[PDB]
CSV table of N, CA and C and ligand atoms in Angstrom, one decimal:
chain,number,residue,atom,x,y,z
A,1,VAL,N,-25.5,-13.9,-59.8
A,1,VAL,CA,-26.9,-14.1,-59.8
A,1,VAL,C,-27.5,-14.2,-58.4
A,2,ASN,N,-28.6,-13.5,-58.1
A,2,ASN,CA,-29.3,-13.6,-56.8
A,2,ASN,C,-30.7,-13.9,-57.1
A,3,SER,N,-31.5,-14.0,-56.0
A,3,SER,CA,-32.9,-14.5,-56.0
A,3,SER,C,-33.9,-13.4,-56.1
A,4,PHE,N,-33.5,-12.1,-56.1
A,4,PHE,CA,-34.5,-11.1,-56.2
A,4,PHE,C,-35.2,-11.1,-57.6
A,5,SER,N,-36.5,-10.9,-57.6
A,5,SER,CA,-37.3,-11.1,-58.8
A,5,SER,C,-38.3,-9.9,-59.0
A,6,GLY,N,-38.4,-9.5,-60.3
A,6,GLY,CA,-39.4,-8.4,-60.6
A,6,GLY,C,-39.0,-7.0,-60.4
A,7,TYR,N,-37.7,-6.8,-60.2
A,7,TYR,CA,-37.2,-5.4,-59.9
A,7,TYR,C,-36.9,-4.7,-61.2
A,8,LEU,N,-37.2,-3.4,-61.2
A,8,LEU,CA,-36.7,-2.5,-62.2
A,8,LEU,C,-35.3,-2.0,-61.9
A,9,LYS,N,-34.4,-2.0,-62.9
A,9,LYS,CA,-33.0,-1.6,-62.7
A,9,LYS,C,-32.9,-0.1,-62.9
A,10,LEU,N,-32.5,0.6,-61.9
A,10,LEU,CA,-32.3,2.0,-62.0
A,10,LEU,C,-30.9,2.4,-62.4
A,11,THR,N,-29.9,1.8,-61.8
A,11,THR,CA,-28.5,2.1,-62.1
A,11,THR,C,-27.7,0.8,-62.1
A,12,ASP,N,-26.4,0.9,-62.2
A,12,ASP,CA,-25.6,-0.3,-62.1
A,12,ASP,C,-25.8,-1.1,-60.9
A,13,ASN,N,-26.2,-0.5,-59.8
A,13,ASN,CA,-26.2,-1.1,-58.5
A,13,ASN,C,-27.5,-1.0,-57.7
A,14,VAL,N,-28.5,-0.2,-58.2
A,14,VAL,CA,-29.7,0.1,-57.5
A,14,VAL,C,-30.9,-0.4,-58.3
A,15,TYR,N,-31.8,-1.2,-57.6
A,15,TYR,CA,-33.0,-1.8,-58.2
A,15,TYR,C,-34.2,-1.4,-57.3
A,16,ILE,N,-35.4,-1.4,-57.9
A,16,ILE,CA,-36.6,-1.0,-57.2
A,16,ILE,C,-37.8,-1.8,-57.6
A,17,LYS,N,-38.7,-1.9,-56.7
A,17,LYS,CA,-39.9,-2.8,-56.9
A,17,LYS,C,-41.0,-2.3,-55.9
A,18,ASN,N,-42.3,-2.3,-56.4
A,18,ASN,CA,-43.5,-2.1,-55.6
A,18,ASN,C,-43.7,-3.4,-54.8
A,19,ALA,N,-43.4,-3.4,-53.5
A,19,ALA,CA,-43.6,-4.6,-52.7
A,19,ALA,C,-43.6,-4.3,-51.3
A,20,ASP,N,-44.2,-5.2,-50.5
A,20,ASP,CA,-44.1,-5.1,-49.0
A,20,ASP,C,-42.8,-5.8,-48.6
A,21,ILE,N,-42.0,-5.0,-47.9
A,21,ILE,CA,-40.6,-5.5,-47.6
A,21,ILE,C,-40.8,-6.7,-46.7
A,22,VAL,N,-41.8,-6.8,-45.9
A,22,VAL,CA,-42.0,-8.0,-45.0
A,22,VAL,C,-42.2,-9.2,-45.9
A,23,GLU,N,-43.1,-9.1,-46.8
A,23,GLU,CA,-43.4,-10.3,-47.7
A,23,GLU,C,-42.2,-10.6,-48.6
A,24,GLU,N,-41.5,-9.5,-49.0
A,24,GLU,CA,-40.3,-9.8,-49.8
A,24,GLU,C,-39.2,-10.5,-49.0
A,25,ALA,N,-39.0,-10.1,-47.8
A,25,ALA,CA,-38.0,-10.7,-46.9
A,25,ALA,C,-38.4,-12.2,-46.7
A,26,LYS,N,-39.7,-12.4,-46.4
A,26,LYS,CA,-40.1,-13.8,-46.1
A,26,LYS,C,-39.8,-14.7,-47.3
A,27,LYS,N,-40.0,-14.2,-48.5
A,27,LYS,CA,-39.8,-15.0,-49.7
A,27,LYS,C,-38.3,-15.2,-50.1
A,28,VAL,N,-37.5,-14.1,-50.0
A,28,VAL,CA,-36.2,-14.2,-50.5
A,28,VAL,C,-35.2,-14.7,-49.4
A,29,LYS,N,-35.5,-14.4,-48.1
A,29,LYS,CA,-34.6,-14.6,-47.0
A,29,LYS,C,-33.2,-14.0,-47.3
A,30,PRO,N,-33.1,-12.7,-47.5
A,30,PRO,CA,-31.9,-12.1,-47.9
A,30,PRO,C,-30.8,-12.2,-46.8
A,31,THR,N,-29.6,-12.0,-47.2
A,31,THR,CA,-28.5,-11.9,-46.2
A,31,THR,C,-28.8,-10.7,-45.2
A,32,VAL,N,-29.2,-9.6,-45.8
A,32,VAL,CA,-29.4,-8.4,-45.0
A,32,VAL,C,-30.8,-7.8,-45.4
A,33,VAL,N,-31.7,-7.6,-44.4
A,33,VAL,CA,-32.8,-6.7,-44.6
A,33,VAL,C,-32.5,-5.4,-43.7
A,34,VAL,N,-32.8,-4.3,-44.3
A,34,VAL,CA,-32.7,-3.0,-43.6
A,34,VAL,C,-34.0,-2.6,-42.9
A,35,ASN,N,-33.9,-2.2,-41.7
A,35,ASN,CA,-35.0,-1.6,-41.0
A,35,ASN,C,-34.8,-0.1,-40.9
A,36,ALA,N,-36.0,0.6,-41.1
A,36,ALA,CA,-36.1,2.0,-40.8
A,36,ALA,C,-36.2,2.2,-39.3
A,37,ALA,N,-35.1,2.2,-38.6
A,37,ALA,CA,-35.1,2.3,-37.2
A,37,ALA,C,-35.0,3.7,-36.7
A,38,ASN,N,-35.4,3.8,-35.4
A,38,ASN,CA,-35.1,5.0,-34.6
A,38,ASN,C,-33.9,4.7,-33.6
A,39,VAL,N,-33.4,5.8,-33.0
A,39,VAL,CA,-32.2,5.7,-32.2
A,39,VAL,C,-32.5,4.8,-31.0
A,40,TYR,N,-33.8,4.6,-30.5
A,40,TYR,CA,-34.1,3.8,-29.4
A,40,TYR,C,-34.4,2.4,-29.8
A,41,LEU,N,-34.4,2.1,-31.1
A,41,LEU,CA,-34.9,0.8,-31.6
A,41,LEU,C,-36.2,0.4,-31.1
A,42,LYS,N,-37.1,1.4,-31.0
A,42,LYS,CA,-38.5,1.2,-30.6
A,42,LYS,C,-39.3,1.0,-31.9
A,43,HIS,N,-39.7,-0.2,-32.2
A,43,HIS,CA,-40.2,-0.6,-33.5
A,43,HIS,C,-41.8,-0.5,-33.5
A,44,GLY,N,-42.3,0.7,-33.5
A,44,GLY,CA,-43.7,0.9,-33.2
A,44,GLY,C,-44.6,0.9,-34.4
A,45,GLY,N,-44.0,1.5,-35.5
A,45,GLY,CA,-44.9,1.7,-36.7
A,45,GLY,C,-44.0,1.8,-37.9
A,46,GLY,N,-44.7,2.1,-39.0
A,46,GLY,CA,-44.0,2.2,-40.3
A,46,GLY,C,-43.4,0.8,-40.6
A,47,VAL,N,-42.2,0.9,-41.3
A,47,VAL,CA,-41.5,-0.3,-41.7
A,47,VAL,C,-41.1,-1.1,-40.4
A,48,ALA,N,-40.6,-0.4,-39.4
A,48,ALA,CA,-40.1,-1.1,-38.3
A,48,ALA,C,-41.2,-1.8,-37.5
A,49,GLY,N,-42.3,-1.2,-37.4
A,49,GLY,CA,-43.4,-1.8,-36.7
A,49,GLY,C,-43.8,-3.1,-37.4
A,50,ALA,N,-43.9,-3.0,-38.8
A,50,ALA,CA,-44.3,-4.2,-39.6
A,50,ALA,C,-43.2,-5.3,-39.5
A,51,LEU,N,-41.9,-5.0,-39.6
A,51,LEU,CA,-40.9,-6.0,-39.5
A,51,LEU,C,-40.9,-6.7,-38.2
A,52,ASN,N,-41.1,-5.9,-37.1
A,52,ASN,CA,-41.1,-6.4,-35.8
A,52,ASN,C,-42.3,-7.3,-35.6
A,53,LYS,N,-43.4,-6.9,-36.0
A,53,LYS,CA,-44.6,-7.7,-35.9
A,53,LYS,C,-44.4,-9.1,-36.6
A,54,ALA,N,-43.8,-9.1,-37.8
A,54,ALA,CA,-43.6,-10.4,-38.5
A,54,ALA,C,-42.6,-11.3,-37.8
A,55,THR,N,-41.8,-10.8,-36.8
A,55,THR,CA,-40.9,-11.6,-36.0
A,55,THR,C,-41.6,-12.0,-34.7
A,56,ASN,N,-42.9,-11.7,-34.5
A,56,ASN,CA,-43.6,-12.0,-33.3
A,56,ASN,C,-43.0,-11.3,-32.1
A,57,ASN,N,-42.5,-10.1,-32.3
A,57,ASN,CA,-41.9,-9.3,-31.3
A,57,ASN,C,-40.4,-9.7,-30.9
A,58,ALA,N,-39.9,-10.7,-31.5
A,58,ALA,CA,-38.5,-11.1,-31.1
A,58,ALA,C,-37.5,-10.0,-31.5
A,59,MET,N,-37.7,-9.3,-32.6
A,59,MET,CA,-36.9,-8.2,-32.9
A,59,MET,C,-36.8,-7.1,-31.8
A,60,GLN,N,-38.0,-6.8,-31.2
A,60,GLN,CA,-38.1,-5.8,-30.2
A,60,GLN,C,-37.4,-6.3,-28.9
A,61,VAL,N,-37.5,-7.6,-28.6
A,61,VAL,CA,-36.9,-8.2,-27.4
A,61,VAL,C,-35.3,-8.1,-27.5
A,62,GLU,N,-34.8,-8.5,-28.7
A,62,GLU,CA,-33.4,-8.4,-29.0
A,62,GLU,C,-32.9,-6.9,-28.9
A,63,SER,N,-33.7,-6.0,-29.5
A,63,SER,CA,-33.4,-4.6,-29.6
A,63,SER,C,-33.3,-4.0,-28.2
A,64,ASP,N,-34.2,-4.4,-27.3
A,64,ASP,CA,-34.2,-3.8,-25.9
A,64,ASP,C,-33.0,-4.2,-25.2
A,65,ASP,N,-32.5,-5.4,-25.4
A,65,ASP,CA,-31.3,-5.9,-24.8
A,65,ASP,C,-30.1,-5.1,-25.4
A,66,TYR,N,-30.1,-4.9,-26.7
A,66,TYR,CA,-29.0,-4.1,-27.3
A,66,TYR,C,-29.0,-2.7,-26.7
A,67,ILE,N,-30.1,-2.0,-26.6
A,67,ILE,CA,-30.1,-0.7,-26.0
A,67,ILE,C,-29.7,-0.6,-24.6
A,68,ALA,N,-30.1,-1.6,-23.8
A,68,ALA,CA,-29.7,-1.7,-22.4
A,68,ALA,C,-28.2,-1.8,-22.3
A,69,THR,N,-27.6,-2.5,-23.2
A,69,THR,CA,-26.1,-2.6,-23.1
A,69,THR,C,-25.4,-1.4,-23.7
A,70,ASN,N,-25.8,-0.9,-24.8
A,70,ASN,CA,-25.1,0.0,-25.6
A,70,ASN,C,-25.6,1.4,-25.7
A,71,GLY,N,-26.8,1.7,-25.2
A,71,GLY,CA,-27.4,3.0,-25.4
A,71,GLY,C,-27.9,3.2,-26.8
A,72,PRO,N,-28.5,4.4,-27.0
A,72,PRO,CA,-29.1,4.7,-28.3
A,72,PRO,C,-28.1,4.8,-29.4
A,73,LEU,N,-28.6,4.5,-30.6
A,73,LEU,CA,-27.8,4.8,-31.8
A,73,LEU,C,-27.8,6.3,-32.1
A,74,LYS,N,-26.9,6.7,-33.0
A,74,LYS,CA,-26.9,8.1,-33.5
A,74,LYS,C,-27.8,8.2,-34.7
A,75,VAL,N,-28.4,9.3,-34.9
A,75,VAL,CA,-29.1,9.6,-36.2
A,75,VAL,C,-28.0,9.6,-37.3
A,76,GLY,N,-28.3,8.8,-38.3
A,76,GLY,CA,-27.3,8.5,-39.4
A,76,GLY,C,-26.5,7.2,-39.1
A,77,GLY,N,-26.7,6.6,-38.0
A,77,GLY,CA,-26.0,5.4,-37.6
A,77,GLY,C,-26.8,4.2,-37.8
A,78,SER,N,-26.1,3.0,-37.4
A,78,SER,CA,-26.7,1.7,-37.6
A,78,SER,C,-26.2,0.7,-36.6
A,79,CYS,N,-26.8,-0.4,-36.5
A,79,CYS,CA,-26.3,-1.6,-35.9
A,79,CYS,C,-26.8,-2.8,-36.6
A,80,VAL,N,-26.0,-3.9,-36.6
A,80,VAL,CA,-26.4,-5.2,-37.2
A,80,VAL,C,-26.9,-6.1,-36.0
A,81,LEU,N,-28.1,-6.6,-36.2
A,81,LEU,CA,-28.7,-7.5,-35.3
A,81,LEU,C,-29.2,-8.7,-36.1
A,82,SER,N,-29.9,-9.6,-35.4
A,82,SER,CA,-30.4,-10.8,-36.1
A,82,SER,C,-31.5,-10.4,-37.1
A,83,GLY,N,-31.6,-11.2,-38.2
A,83,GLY,CA,-32.8,-11.1,-39.1
A,83,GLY,C,-33.9,-11.9,-38.7
A,84,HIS,N,-33.8,-12.7,-37.7
A,84,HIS,CA,-34.9,-13.6,-37.1
A,84,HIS,C,-35.4,-14.5,-38.3
A,85,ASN,N,-36.7,-14.5,-38.5
A,85,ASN,CA,-37.3,-15.4,-39.5
A,85,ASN,C,-37.4,-14.7,-40.9
A,86,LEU,N,-36.8,-13.5,-41.0
A,86,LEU,CA,-36.9,-12.7,-42.2
A,86,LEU,C,-35.7,-12.6,-43.1
A,87,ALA,N,-34.5,-12.8,-42.5
A,87,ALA,CA,-33.2,-12.6,-43.1
A,87,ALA,C,-32.2,-13.1,-42.2
A,88,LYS,N,-30.9,-13.3,-42.7
A,88,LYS,CA,-29.8,-13.6,-41.8
A,88,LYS,C,-29.6,-12.5,-40.8
A,89,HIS,N,-29.5,-11.3,-41.3
A,89,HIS,CA,-29.2,-10.1,-40.5
A,89,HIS,C,-30.2,-9.1,-40.7
A,90,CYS,N,-30.4,-8.2,-39.7
A,90,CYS,CA,-31.1,-7.0,-39.9
A,90,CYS,C,-30.2,-5.8,-39.6
A,91,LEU,N,-30.0,-5.0,-40.6
A,91,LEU,CA,-29.2,-3.7,-40.5
A,91,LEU,C,-30.2,-2.6,-40.1
A,92,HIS,N,-30.2,-2.2,-38.8
A,92,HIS,CA,-31.1,-1.2,-38.3
A,92,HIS,C,-30.4,0.1,-38.6
A,93,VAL,N,-31.0,0.9,-39.5
A,93,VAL,CA,-30.4,2.2,-39.9
A,93,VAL,C,-31.3,3.4,-39.5
A,94,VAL,N,-30.8,4.4,-38.9
A,94,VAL,CA,-31.5,5.5,-38.5
A,94,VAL,C,-31.4,6.7,-39.5
A,95,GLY,N,-32.4,6.9,-40.3
A,95,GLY,CA,-32.4,8.1,-41.1
A,95,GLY,C,-33.0,9.2,-40.3
A,96,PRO,N,-32.8,10.5,-40.6
A,96,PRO,CA,-33.4,11.6,-39.9
A,96,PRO,C,-34.9,11.6,-40.0
A,97,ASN,N,-35.6,11.9,-38.9
A,97,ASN,CA,-37.1,12.0,-38.9
A,97,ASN,C,-37.4,13.5,-39.0
A,98,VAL,N,-37.9,13.9,-40.1
A,98,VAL,CA,-38.3,15.3,-40.4
A,98,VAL,C,-39.4,15.7,-39.4
A,99,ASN,N,-40.3,14.8,-39.0
A,99,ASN,CA,-41.3,15.1,-38.0
A,99,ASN,C,-40.7,15.3,-36.6
A,100,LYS,N,-39.4,15.1,-36.4
A,100,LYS,CA,-38.7,15.5,-35.2
A,100,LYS,C,-37.8,16.6,-35.3
A,101,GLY,N,-37.7,17.2,-36.5
A,101,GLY,CA,-36.8,18.3,-36.8
A,101,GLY,C,-35.3,17.9,-37.1
A,102,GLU,N,-35.1,16.7,-37.4
A,102,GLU,CA,-33.7,16.2,-37.6
A,102,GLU,C,-33.2,16.6,-39.0
A,103,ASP,N,-31.8,16.9,-39.1
A,103,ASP,CA,-31.2,17.4,-40.3
A,103,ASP,C,-31.3,16.4,-41.4
A,104,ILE,N,-31.8,16.8,-42.6
A,104,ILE,CA,-31.9,16.0,-43.7
A,104,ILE,C,-30.6,15.6,-44.3
A,105,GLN,N,-29.6,16.5,-44.1
A,105,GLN,CA,-28.2,16.1,-44.5
A,105,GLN,C,-27.7,14.8,-43.9
A,106,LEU,N,-28.3,14.4,-42.8
A,106,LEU,CA,-27.9,13.1,-42.2
A,106,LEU,C,-28.4,11.9,-43.0
A,107,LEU,N,-29.2,12.2,-44.0
A,107,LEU,CA,-29.7,11.0,-44.8
A,107,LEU,C,-28.5,10.4,-45.6
A,108,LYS,N,-27.6,11.2,-46.1
A,108,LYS,CA,-26.5,10.6,-46.8
A,108,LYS,C,-25.6,9.7,-45.9
A,109,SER,N,-25.4,10.2,-44.6
A,109,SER,CA,-24.7,9.4,-43.7
A,109,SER,C,-25.4,8.1,-43.4
A,110,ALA,N,-26.7,8.1,-43.3
A,110,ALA,CA,-27.5,6.9,-43.1
A,110,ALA,C,-27.3,5.9,-44.2
A,111,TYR,N,-27.4,6.4,-45.4
A,111,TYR,CA,-27.2,5.4,-46.6
A,111,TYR,C,-25.8,4.9,-46.6
A,112,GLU,N,-24.8,5.6,-46.1
A,112,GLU,CA,-23.4,5.1,-46.2
A,112,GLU,C,-23.3,3.8,-45.4
A,113,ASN,N,-24.1,3.5,-44.4
A,113,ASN,CA,-24.1,2.3,-43.8
A,113,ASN,C,-24.3,1.1,-44.7
A,114,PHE,N,-25.1,1.3,-45.8
A,114,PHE,CA,-25.4,0.2,-46.7
A,114,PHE,C,-24.1,-0.3,-47.4
A,115,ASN,N,-23.1,0.6,-47.5
A,115,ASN,CA,-21.9,0.2,-48.2
A,115,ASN,C,-21.0,-0.9,-47.5
A,116,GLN,N,-21.4,-1.2,-46.2
A,116,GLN,CA,-20.7,-2.2,-45.5
A,116,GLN,C,-21.3,-3.6,-45.8
A,117,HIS,N,-22.2,-3.7,-46.7
A,117,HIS,CA,-22.9,-5.0,-47.1
A,117,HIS,C,-23.0,-5.1,-48.6
A,118,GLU,N,-22.6,-6.3,-49.1
A,118,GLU,CA,-22.5,-6.4,-50.5
A,118,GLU,C,-23.9,-6.4,-51.2
A,119,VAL,N,-24.9,-6.9,-50.6
A,119,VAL,CA,-26.3,-6.9,-51.1
A,119,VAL,C,-27.3,-6.7,-50.0
A,120,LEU,N,-28.3,-5.9,-50.2
A,120,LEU,CA,-29.3,-5.6,-49.2
A,120,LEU,C,-30.7,-5.5,-49.8
A,121,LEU,N,-31.7,-5.9,-49.0
A,121,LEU,CA,-33.1,-5.5,-49.3
A,121,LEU,C,-33.4,-4.4,-48.3
A,122,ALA,N,-34.0,-3.3,-48.8
A,122,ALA,CA,-34.1,-2.1,-48.0
A,122,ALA,C,-35.4,-1.3,-48.4
A,123,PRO,N,-35.9,-0.5,-47.5
A,123,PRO,CA,-36.8,0.6,-47.8
A,123,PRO,C,-36.1,1.9,-48.1
A,124,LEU,N,-36.8,2.9,-48.6
A,124,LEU,CA,-36.3,4.2,-48.7
A,124,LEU,C,-36.1,4.9,-47.4
A,125,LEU,N,-34.9,5.2,-47.0
A,125,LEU,CA,-34.7,5.8,-45.7
A,125,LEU,C,-35.4,7.2,-45.5
A,126,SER,N,-35.9,7.4,-44.4
A,126,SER,CA,-36.5,8.7,-44.0
A,126,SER,C,-37.9,9.0,-44.7
A,127,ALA,N,-38.3,8.0,-45.5
A,127,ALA,CA,-39.6,8.1,-46.2
A,127,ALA,C,-40.8,7.7,-45.2
A,128,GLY,N,-42.0,7.7,-45.7
A,128,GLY,CA,-43.1,7.3,-44.9
A,128,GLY,C,-43.2,8.2,-43.7
A,129,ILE,N,-43.4,7.6,-42.5
A,129,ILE,CA,-43.7,8.4,-41.3
A,129,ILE,C,-42.5,9.2,-40.8
A,130,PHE,N,-41.3,9.0,-41.4
A,130,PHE,CA,-40.1,9.8,-41.1
A,130,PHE,C,-40.2,11.2,-41.8
A,131,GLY,N,-41.1,11.4,-42.7
A,131,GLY,CA,-41.5,12.7,-43.2
A,131,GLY,C,-40.6,13.3,-44.3
A,132,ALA,N,-39.6,12.6,-44.8
A,132,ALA,CA,-38.8,13.2,-45.9
A,132,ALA,C,-39.5,12.9,-47.3
A,133,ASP,N,-39.1,13.6,-48.3
A,133,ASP,CA,-39.5,13.4,-49.7
A,133,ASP,C,-39.0,12.1,-50.2
A,134,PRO,N,-39.8,11.1,-50.5
A,134,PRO,CA,-39.2,9.8,-51.0
A,134,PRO,C,-38.4,10.0,-52.3
A,135,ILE,N,-38.8,10.9,-53.2
A,135,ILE,CA,-38.0,11.2,-54.4
A,135,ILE,C,-36.6,11.6,-54.1
A,136,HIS,N,-36.4,12.5,-53.1
A,136,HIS,CA,-35.1,12.9,-52.6
A,136,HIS,C,-34.3,11.7,-52.0
A,137,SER,N,-35.0,11.0,-51.2
A,137,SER,CA,-34.4,9.8,-50.6
A,137,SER,C,-33.8,8.8,-51.6
A,138,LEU,N,-34.6,8.6,-52.7
A,138,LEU,CA,-34.1,7.7,-53.8
A,138,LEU,C,-32.9,8.3,-54.4
A,139,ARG,N,-32.9,9.7,-54.7
A,139,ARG,CA,-31.7,10.3,-55.2
A,139,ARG,C,-30.5,10.1,-54.4
A,140,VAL,N,-30.6,10.4,-53.1
A,140,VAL,CA,-29.5,10.2,-52.2
A,140,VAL,C,-29.0,8.7,-52.2
A,141,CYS,N,-29.9,7.8,-52.2
A,141,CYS,CA,-29.6,6.4,-52.2
A,141,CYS,C,-28.7,6.1,-53.4
A,142,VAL,N,-29.2,6.5,-54.6
A,142,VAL,CA,-28.4,6.2,-55.9
A,142,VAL,C,-27.1,6.8,-55.8
A,143,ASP,N,-27.0,8.0,-55.3
A,143,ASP,CA,-25.7,8.8,-55.3
A,143,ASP,C,-24.8,8.4,-54.1
A,144,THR,N,-25.2,7.5,-53.2
A,144,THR,CA,-24.4,7.2,-52.0
A,144,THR,C,-24.1,5.7,-52.0
A,145,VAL,N,-25.0,4.9,-52.2
A,145,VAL,CA,-24.8,3.4,-52.1
A,145,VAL,C,-24.1,2.9,-53.3
A,146,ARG,N,-23.1,2.2,-53.1
A,146,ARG,CA,-22.3,1.5,-54.2
A,146,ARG,C,-22.5,0.0,-54.2
A,147,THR,N,-22.9,-0.6,-53.2
A,147,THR,CA,-23.2,-2.0,-53.1
A,147,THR,C,-24.6,-2.2,-53.7
A,148,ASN,N,-25.0,-3.5,-53.8
A,148,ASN,CA,-26.2,-3.9,-54.6
A,148,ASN,C,-27.4,-3.7,-53.7
A,149,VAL,N,-28.3,-2.8,-54.0
A,149,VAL,CA,-29.5,-2.5,-53.1
A,149,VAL,C,-30.7,-2.8,-53.9
A,150,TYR,N,-31.6,-3.5,-53.3
A,150,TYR,CA,-33.0,-3.9,-53.8
A,150,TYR,C,-34.0,-3.1,-52.9
A,151,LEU,N,-34.6,-2.1,-53.5
A,151,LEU,CA,-35.5,-1.2,-52.7
A,151,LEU,C,-36.9,-1.7,-52.9
A,152,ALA,N,-37.6,-1.8,-51.8
A,152,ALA,CA,-39.0,-2.2,-51.7
A,152,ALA,C,-39.9,-1.0,-51.4
A,153,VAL,N,-40.8,-0.6,-52.2
A,153,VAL,CA,-41.7,0.5,-52.0
A,153,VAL,C,-43.1,0.0,-51.9
A,154,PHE,N,-43.7,0.1,-50.7
A,154,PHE,CA,-45.0,-0.5,-50.3
A,154,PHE,C,-46.1,0.1,-51.2
A,155,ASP,N,-46.1,1.5,-51.4
A,155,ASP,CA,-47.2,2.2,-52.0
A,155,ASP,C,-47.0,2.1,-53.5
A,156,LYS,N,-48.0,1.5,-54.2
A,156,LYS,CA,-47.9,1.4,-55.7
A,156,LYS,C,-47.9,2.8,-56.3
A,157,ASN,N,-48.7,3.7,-55.8
A,157,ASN,CA,-48.8,5.0,-56.4
A,157,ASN,C,-47.4,5.7,-56.3
A,158,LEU,N,-46.8,5.6,-55.1
A,158,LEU,CA,-45.5,6.2,-54.9
A,158,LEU,C,-44.4,5.5,-55.8
A,159,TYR,N,-44.5,4.2,-55.9
A,159,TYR,CA,-43.5,3.5,-56.8
A,159,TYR,C,-43.6,4.0,-58.2
A,160,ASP,N,-44.8,4.2,-58.8
A,160,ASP,CA,-44.9,4.7,-60.1
A,160,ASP,C,-44.3,6.1,-60.3
A,161,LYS,N,-44.5,6.9,-59.3
A,161,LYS,CA,-44.0,8.3,-59.3
A,161,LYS,C,-42.5,8.3,-59.2
A,162,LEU,N,-41.9,7.4,-58.4
A,162,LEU,CA,-40.4,7.3,-58.3
A,162,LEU,C,-39.8,6.9,-59.6
A,163,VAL,N,-40.4,5.9,-60.2
A,163,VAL,CA,-39.9,5.4,-61.5
A,163,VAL,C,-40.0,6.5,-62.6
A,164,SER,N,-41.3,7.0,-62.7
A,164,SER,CA,-41.5,8.0,-63.8
A,164,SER,C,-40.7,9.3,-63.6
A,165,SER,N,-40.3,9.6,-62.4
A,165,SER,CA,-39.6,10.9,-62.2
A,165,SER,C,-38.1,10.7,-62.0
A,166,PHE,N,-37.6,9.5,-62.2
A,166,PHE,CA,-36.2,9.2,-61.9
A,166,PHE,C,-35.3,9.7,-63.0
A,167,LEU,N,-34.3,10.4,-62.7
A,167,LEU,CA,-33.4,11.0,-63.6
A,167,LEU,C,-32.2,10.0,-63.8
B,1,LIG,O1,-43.7,2.6,-49.1
B,1,LIG,C1,-42.9,3.3,-48.4
B,1,LIG,C2,-42.3,4.6,-48.9
B,1,LIG,C3,-41.6,5.1,-47.6
B,1,LIG,C4,-41.7,4.1,-46.5
B,1,LIG,C5,-42.0,4.6,-45.1
B,1,LIG,C6,-42.9,5.6,-44.8
B,1,LIG,C7,-43.1,5.8,-43.4
B,1,LIG,C8,-42.3,5.0,-42.6
B,1,LIG,S1,-41.4,3.9,-43.6
B,1,LIG,N1,-42.6,3.0,-47.1
B,1,LIG,N2,-43.0,1.9,-46.4
B,1,LIG,C9,-42.9,0.5,-46.6
B,1,LIG,N3,-42.1,0.0,-47.6
B,1,LIG,C10,-41.9,-1.3,-47.8
B,1,LIG,N4,-42.5,-2.3,-47.1
B,1,LIG,C11,-43.3,-1.9,-46.1
B,1,LIG,N5,-44.1,-2.6,-45.2
B,1,LIG,C12,-44.7,-1.9,-44.3
B,1,LIG,C13,-44.4,-0.5,-44.7
B,1,LIG,I1,-45.1,1.1,-43.7
B,1,LIG,C14,-43.6,-0.5,-45.8
């Protein structure tokens, strides 16, 4: 039993909810919140901009030190950093950004990072300003993640379409 509330169960291990991931993280304080990161960990907009804002820019400060030491992530890759006031840990995962021409096949590799964590609160990777089809992203998530994932979908209209169209 865990503290997530109000989720629709899609499969044995995948759950979904219309919610703001920032507000969901602040309420649940999960072990892992997933960020929709880019390879430079520049958290300017979308989910990343919102999560970083909620940490009062501490996420960005930590991230800049990480990049200075380690260099950029790979598309499809991830790193574990602090969750600050939102979670114990933040798993920064880089899905392909279609608006940059990145290969959508890398979306499966991105979701594979979730399997290193027993339970996660997460957005749909590569959705929103990353330009991929959120219905497809949900399909890849369900077919790739085997650990327990709680998906937060900010847009109510999108959430209803994802549920209604889910096979
Ligand atoms: O609703 C969706 C569907 C795809 C995804 C993205 C689209 C472009 C970049 S990410 N998204 N965003 C969010 N999901 C949950 N909480 C959130 N808080 C702030 C935001 I913005 C946000």
